[PDB]
Symmetry: C5
Subunit: 205 residues, 5 copies
């Protein structure tokens, strides 16, 4: 569409994806949740879990807003995430890079709200010695910004999902809880928030 | 050809491959089909299937059309798919990224119709516990746009293929059916279409 | 050389490597041959062969010619293949992308004749159930353009090679024959050519 | 922030990340330390250790400083490490490239001090034949600049860490020492510094 | 340094890394040597050797020289090898691409002499059936330009190294010799030089 093309032309003009879109010392609030689509494997010897997780991230970037009357009909645009600022959220437990299974695209609406929903295949470290018991194994998946404290990037939780779990995998999901925290570290004056998912599962065997 | 060179020079001038080529709120219709060239492996423990599939996608991009009388002789051009908009179609069942086996080129004709026919090696999740039975295992391969609803991208089916199947693999293909759906999701007002291929196969023994 | 530098400066100026260098509806003739340097492995379970093959491709690109009297001393130049048009030749039997073992460079002479001789490590599909028999296994390696028909790209065969075969591998090469064909496909009006190498080999044990 | 955006615009203008930011023949001092987060595996046959290590590097780049009164509020910025000069520090014992697990971002303050803290998964060569003894196996992890001698890049040590070690891995960390050295090599007039970590560990079983 | 920054700015201005820096039909002399740091593995079944080798390459590029009085203090610069012309030297025996373990940087001095010293992990083909004998296995590692004959690129040998060999690997290095040759091939009028390293080794038991 013609108004879409003009809209994209304006991004490349003025926008720097390296700059976190804070304003007036207000943080950028990033909503974060997770759906555990699969447990692919559990390596009992090496204390590693292999999962597919669907992350849901959303935030407002004030630099991405436009006047709906100046680009009529254009309600949302699909945009390569590499051309936007994105949260530098890291899974602390990860022992390999993530493999992103989905197109690397974000949805952005007229008031600059961005939705980025990557599905990833990820291996991470966890004590899984309980996995063949009734109790199962319980792993923590701690997520947080690598470089931004609470006054720059305000990580916030949202309602999660057991409904995406693939029923035919050889592990059953006993449950998932989630918790947001602020911690300090000896380096830095300001607190860093994290959102941690506690996941309990066991072998169907 | 000299007219070919002038024709390509015009693409780089006006064209943004990030923008879906809708016009007048009309969707872009994308025709989608599949030929299952091979079942390479079936991992019974991890519930994974390894295939080579040949996808056939085609759509019209109105920005790619030209006057055949102004570029005489030039009936179709071979073009890197990376310089065109392409459908963000995803295999929902995939547990790894696809490996594209074919040149990343599309054919485009004078009225802007694009053919993109990648062959991919792909591993995906499926309940394969039936694979050593007469009934075999039946897997769904659901394909759909990750970011575009029906009013932007109208996914449509076409005539599929058993004729490419490699006869000497250790799995025999019992059959393939296909089905198009529109579904809604709790988020979004507009429906997303998918095309799903149901594939039944079994070990030869 | 100083004349070499001026010669390269002229490529970047006028040349588009995406455009097949046909002229006056005449095809570009591409000469194609192969030397099978090694059979690395044969996977009897998965019906896969692992080889190193040395391809020899050559064609004339009329846009790459220059006046030898205007660039004196410059008889041929070594050029990154990515900055030239190259044939989009594909091994139809391949089940993984190729791994190129050689510098990605082509030789080009003053009348625009290009030599490109990549050595590749490649795994491909083949019925190898005969490999521990006197008859051995016989595999077809079919090569062809993915996007260009006979009137654009005229694929032509040349004299091949058993002399590069590594004598100490655990497979012996019984023989190699080669054949050029034209086929039609239901889509397209024009025929596509291929060059197929039939390779027979067996386990030494 | 608006002052943040103007600040980044000035980097791209004047700055070359290939140039080591020495001044007045003074070296760039790079502070270096390590936290050994995990021993993932030990390959006794191939004499290889697989670890995750968290490196802490910091240096001053005089070209990155700014006036705090001219960019009010802007105390530190998060920046892609690829757009800054970075130390070419190498783990001498490495037998594969590193896999970086963290966002490739550095913190930079107003006086051009840069903090870069990558976590890496890395396999390296070590005599591990002692690993199931009380004494354990003792490995050297020698780190140093690949191309800069002491008068250009002054590598300096800092206080290290056993406290990050994951308690549930099947190896226990006995102890870590660290040592800085200057050596000469027959080639070169100037000495090269290194920082070496000696790490002792053993199988728990 | 300020003079360093101006020096780099001049490279990007005038220099093309695709052009071999011959002058007055004189070849570019490339000095080549090798230190075999490790034998990682020997695959007896597939006739493959896995090594880490440290290559030492040096040549003069007349386009890289500068006046020391015009860039005072600047004696050598560390430069990404991708921004310089480099020899297209190939290990003829290689069955996989190399993995470069070192920063991809070269040293260049004021008279345009370039030092490039990559350490690589490389698997290559060799008859290793002797590896469990007193005699051991003897492999040839033949290195040479892929596209340049002797009158363009004059490959020359230098004094090599057993002193880097890791003492704790399960193979002992019996010896390494080296030899330079000129050969002709039926295609081409001019001879191609190579430098071959003969390496003898055996399992320690
Ligand atoms: C951007 O970030 C950088 C790094 O954090 C900051 O630069 C540092 O600034 C601090 C504070 O000014 C410096 O700390 C001071 O350093 C003095 C010199 O230290 C060096 O030299 C001595 C030997 O003479 C060594 O022992 C020492 O390890 C260093 O090599 C010290 O003398 C100071 O110590 C005294 O004051 C402190 C504070 O009151 C007392 O607690 C001490 O007991 C002591 O009496 C002091 O530690 C530091 O050197 C700088 N680091 C670097 C790496 O350069 C920038 O300030 C920051 N920019 C902005 C705008 O904030
Ligand atoms: C650029 O390279 C090409 C390819 O190497 C050169 O063309 C080839 O030149 C050979 C040798 O001269 C030709 O063979 C000759 O054919 C005639 C009969 O037709 C015969 O009299 C000779 O004995 C010899 O066999 C060959 O046909 C030709 N091949 C192709 C594909 O064009 C070309 O000369 C080079 N250009 C320049 C400017 O050097
Ligand atoms: C940049 O580094 C290169 C390589 O170290 C330097 O070139 C080398 O310079 C030395 C001393 O000038 C040369 O030695 C001389 O060689 C000649 C001819 O063979 C001989 O007759 C003399 O007795 C003397 O030994 C050396 O050959 C030369 N090497 C190469 C490969 O060119 C260069 O000088 C350095 N430049 C600066 C400014 O540091
Ligand atoms: C852009 O998207 C956001 C998020 O979907 C919309 O903001 C929400 O608006 C609804 C009420 O209309 C409420 O759920 C919340 O108050 C908002 N959510 C958040 C996360 O801020 C916003 O309306 C959209 N803008 C437009 C113009 O459509
Ligand atoms: C470009 O290709 C498309 C698809 O092959 C052509 O559209 C078809 O036109 C024929 C008319 O003979 C119809 O019967 C088909 O049903 C059309 N298909 C679709 C999807 O539109 C188009 O005509 C071609 N353009 C040119 C100039 O040849
Ligand atoms: C179609 N898709 C979303 C696409 C979208 O709007 C989107 C994409 C990318 C970024 C931002 C938004 C909208 C909500 C449904 C979802 C698909 C399903 O939940 C799903 C996802 C992953 C595995 C299995 C099933
Ligand atoms: C030759 N090729 C197509 C090439 C083309 O025109 C094309 C390429 C790329 C984009 C658009 C069109 C046209 C239809 C036939 C096909 C070849 C065979 O079906 C095949 C496909 C996959 C594996 C094995 C064999
Ligand atoms: C030296 N080299 C070629 C290099 C060249 O001129 C060339 C390179 C790239 C493009 C165009 C031409 C020319 C023909 C001989 C060949 C060497 C041997 O046959 C060989 C090839 C592959 C594996 C093992 C041995
Ligand atoms: C939050 N994070 C650092 C982030 C930061 O300031 C930083 C990042 C990148 C560049 C420069 C600075 C500061 C120190 C604490 C650390 C987190 C924890 O110790 C940790 C590190 C590695 C693995 C597991 C856990
Ligand atoms: C410090 N380093 C070289 C670094 C340099 O100046 C250099 C780097 C890159 C390009 C040109 C020159 C110079 C010669 C010594 C070498 C280190 C040692 O041999 C070594 C190599 C590999 C494993 C263990 C030890
Ligand atoms: O340039 C953009 N917004 C500024 C408003 C100018 O009217 C913008 C945001 C997104 Br998402 C795109 Br595409 N462009
Ligand atoms: O590992 C992560 N960060 C590194 C990015 C590439 O260097 C990461 C990001 C997200 Br979202 C997850 Br889950 N992990
Ligand atoms: O997984 C797919 N897309 C990922 C994009 C890169 O992150 C994908 C596309 C198609 Br067609 C298939 Br099958 N999978
Ligand atoms: O720019 C193109 N066409 C529009 C102008 C008509 O003269 C165009 C289409 C394709 Br396909 C290429 Br390449 N360029
Ligand atoms: O798979 C092939 N082509 C895809 C595009 C580049 O990877 C291919 C080409 C050749 Br030659 C072989 Br063998 N495979
Ligand atoms: O510019 C080139 N050819 C056109 C002729 C201009 O007089 C050219 C061909 C090659 Br190969 C290079 Br490098 N440049
Ligand atoms: O095969 C080599 N080069 C191909 C192009 C770059 O990947 C090569 C060079 C050297 Br030195 C070795 Br060992 N292999
Ligand atoms: O440009 C920067 N600093 C110089 C000040 C000129 O106004 C600079 C440093 C960093 Br980190 C960024 Br982003 N910009
Ligand atoms: O610019 C450079 N040399 C061209 C001649 C001007 O004196 C040059 C060489 C190297 Br290494 C760099 Br960085 N720049
Ligand atoms: O090998 C290293 N550097 C080369 C650049 C590409 O990997 C390296 C750096 C560090 Br820190 C480690 Br550990 N390895």
């Amino acid at each position: 569409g013609e108004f879409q093309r003009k809209l994209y032309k304006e991004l490349v003009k003025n926008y720097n994806p390296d700059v976190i879109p804070t304003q007036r010392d207000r943080p950028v609030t990033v909503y974060f949740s997770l759906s555990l689509l699969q447990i692919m494997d559990v390596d009992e010897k090496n204390q590693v879990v292999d999962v597919v997780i669907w992350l849901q991230m959303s935030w407002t970037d004030h630099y991405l807003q436009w006047n709906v009357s100046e680009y009529p009909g254009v309600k949302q645009v699909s945009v390569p995430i590499s051309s936007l600022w994105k949260p530098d959220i890291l899974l602390y437990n990860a022992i390999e890079r993530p493999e992103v299974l989905t197109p690397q695209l974000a949805l952005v609406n007229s008031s600059g709200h961005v939705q980025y929903l990557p599905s990833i295949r990820q291996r991470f470290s966890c004590d899984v010695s309980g996995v063949d018991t009734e109790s199962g194994a319980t792993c923590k998946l701690k997520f947080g910004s690598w470089t931004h404290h609470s006054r720059e990037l305000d990580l916030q939780m949202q309602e999660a999902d057991i409904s995406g779990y693939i029923p035919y995998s050889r592990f059953e999901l006993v449950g998932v809880t989630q918790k947001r925290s602020e911690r300090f570290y000896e380096c830095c004056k300001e607190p860093y928030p994290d959102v941690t998912f506690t996941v309990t599962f066991r072998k169907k065997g």
